[PDB]
Design a protein around this ligand. Sequence first.
Ligand SMILES: CC(C)[C@H]1CCCN1c1ncnc2[nH]ccc12
Ligand SMILES: [Cl-]
Length: 167
Amino acid sequence: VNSFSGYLKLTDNVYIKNADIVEEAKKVKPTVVVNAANVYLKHGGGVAGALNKATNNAMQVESDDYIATNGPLKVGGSCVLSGHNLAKHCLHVVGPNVNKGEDIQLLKSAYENFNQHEVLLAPLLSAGIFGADPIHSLRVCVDTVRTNVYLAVFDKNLYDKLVSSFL
Ligand SMILES: CC(C)[C@H]1CCCN1c1ncnc2[nH]ccc12
Ligand SMILES: [Cl-]
């Protein structure tokens, strides 16, 4: 039993809710919140810009030190950093950005990072300003993640389409 509330159960391990991931994280304080990161951990917009804003830029400060030490992530890769005031940890995961011409097959690799964590709060990878088809992202999530994932979808109209079209 966990404190996530109001989720629709899509499968044995995948749950979904129309919710602002920022507000969800502040309420639940999950062990792991997933960020929709880029390889430079430059949290300027989309989910990443919103999460970073909620940390008063502490996420960005920590991220800049991480990049200065380690260099950029790989597309499809991840790193674990602090969750600041939002969660114990933040798993920064880089899905392919279609508006950069990145290979959509890497979306499965991106979701594989979730399997290293028993329970996560997360957005749909490569959705929003990353330009992938969210119905596809949900399909890959369900077919790749085996741990317990609670998906927050910001857009109510998109949420209704994902549920109604879910096979
Ligand atoms: C609409 C969703 C599929 C993705 C794509 C863009 C933004 N988005 C978000 N999802 C969850 N929580 C969020 N908080 C702020 C933005 C945001
Ligand atoms: Cl985004």
